[PDB]
Design a protein around this motif. Sequence first.
Motif, PDB file in Angstrom:
ATOM      1  N   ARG A  22       1.154  -1.383   0.081  1.00  0.00           N
ATOM      2  CA  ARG A  22       0.251  -0.078  -0.158  1.00  0.00           C
ATOM      3  C   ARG A  22       0.838   1.303  -0.169  1.00  0.00           C
ATOM      4  O   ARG A  22       1.251   1.859   1.051  1.00  0.00           O
ATOM      5  CB  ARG A  22      -1.125  -0.036   1.076  1.00  0.00           C
ATOM      6  N   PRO A  23       1.377   1.583  -1.141  1.00  0.00           N
ATOM      7  CA  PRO A  23       2.071   2.744  -1.278  1.00  0.00           C
ATOM      8  C   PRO A  23       1.602   4.034  -0.707  1.00  0.00           C
ATOM      9  O   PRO A  23       0.453   4.176  -0.948  1.00  0.00           O
ATOM     10  CB  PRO A  23       2.408   3.067  -3.042  1.00  0.00           C
ATOM     11  N   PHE A  24       2.199   4.947  -0.007  1.00  0.00           N
ATOM     12  CA  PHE A  24       1.535   6.019   0.497  1.00  0.00           C
ATOM     13  C   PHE A  24       2.202   7.411  -0.379  1.00  0.00           C
ATOM     14  O   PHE A  24       2.985   7.979   0.309  1.00  0.00           O
ATOM     15  CB  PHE A  24       1.764   6.238   2.053  1.00  0.00           C
ATOM     16  N   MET A  25       1.757   7.670  -1.447  1.00  0.00           N
ATOM     17  CA  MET A  25       2.350   9.046  -2.195  1.00  0.00           C
ATOM     18  C   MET A  25       1.282   9.903  -2.461  1.00  0.00           C
ATOM     19  O   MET A  25       0.103   9.732  -2.275  1.00  0.00           O
ATOM     20  CB  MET A  25       2.828   8.759  -3.552  1.00  0.00           C
ATOM     21  N   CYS A  26       1.725  11.366  -2.281  1.00  0.00           N
ATOM     22  CA  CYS A  26       0.709  12.287  -2.328  1.00  0.00           C
ATOM     23  C   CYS A  26       0.369  12.785  -3.893  1.00  0.00           C
ATOM     24  O   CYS A  26       1.098  12.441  -4.827  1.00  0.00           O
ATOM     25  CB  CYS A  26       1.446  13.545  -1.894  1.00  0.00           C
ATOM     26  N   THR A  27      -0.898  12.954  -4.130  1.00  0.00           N
ATOM     27  CA  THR A  27      -1.442  12.880  -5.542  1.00  0.00           C
ATOM     28  C   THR A  27      -1.631  14.402  -5.951  1.00  0.00           C
ATOM     29  O   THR A  27      -2.689  15.404  -5.731  1.00  0.00           O
ATOM     30  CB  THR A  27      -2.877  12.424  -5.653  1.00  0.00           C
ATOM     31  N   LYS A  51       5.604  13.317  -3.242  1.00  0.00           N
ATOM     32  CA  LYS A  51       6.411  13.171  -1.969  1.00  0.00           C
ATOM     33  C   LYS A  51       5.763  11.404  -1.407  1.00  0.00           C
ATOM     34  O   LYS A  51       4.695  11.323  -1.403  1.00  0.00           O
ATOM     35  CB  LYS A  51       6.080  14.243  -1.349  1.00  0.00           C
ATOM     36  N   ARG A  52       6.690  10.755  -0.823  1.00  0.00           N
ATOM     37  CA  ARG A  52       6.172   9.460  -0.599  1.00  0.00           C
ATOM     38  C   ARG A  52       6.121   9.718   1.005  1.00  0.00           C
ATOM     39  O   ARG A  52       6.835  10.469   1.809  1.00  0.00           O
ATOM     40  CB  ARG A  52       7.100   8.503  -0.948  1.00  0.00           C
ATOM     41  N   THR A  96       5.351   6.795   4.887  1.00  0.00           N
ATOM     42  CA  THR A  96       5.340   5.769   5.626  1.00  0.00           C
ATOM     43  C   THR A  96       4.199   5.351   6.186  1.00  0.00           C
ATOM     44  O   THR A  96       3.950   4.461   7.131  1.00  0.00           O
ATOM     45  CB  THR A  96       6.511   5.214   6.428  1.00  0.00           C
ATOM     46  N   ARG A  97       3.254   6.112   5.961  1.00  0.00           N
ATOM     47  CA  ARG A  97       1.890   6.184   6.667  1.00  0.00           C
ATOM     48  C   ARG A  97       0.747   7.221   5.949  1.00  0.00           C
ATOM     49  O   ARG A  97       1.184   8.419   6.235  1.00  0.00           O
ATOM     50  CB  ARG A  97       2.090   6.343   8.114  1.00  0.00           C
ATOM     51  N   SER A  98      -0.321   6.703   5.444  1.00  0.00           N
ATOM     52  CA  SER A  98      -1.071   7.818   4.990  1.00  0.00           C
ATOM     53  C   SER A  98      -1.395   8.885   5.912  1.00  0.00           C
ATOM     54  O   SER A  98      -1.763  10.030   5.851  1.00  0.00           O
ATOM     55  CB  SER A  98      -2.542   7.143   4.577  1.00  0.00           C
TER      56      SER A  98
END
Length: 31
Positions: A1-6, A12-13, A15-17
């Motif tokens: 479950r990748p957590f990157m900004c849209t 920017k990535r 390690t936690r939404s």
Amino acid sequence: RPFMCTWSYCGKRFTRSDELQRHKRTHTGEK
Ligand SMILES: [Zn+2]
């Protein structure tokens, strides 16, 4: 479950939404 900004100019990535929550609020501020 990748957590990157849209957003553009961001990419920017994280390690936690959780960080993505307070991060997306800094992309469309000025209210
Ligand atoms: Zn972003």
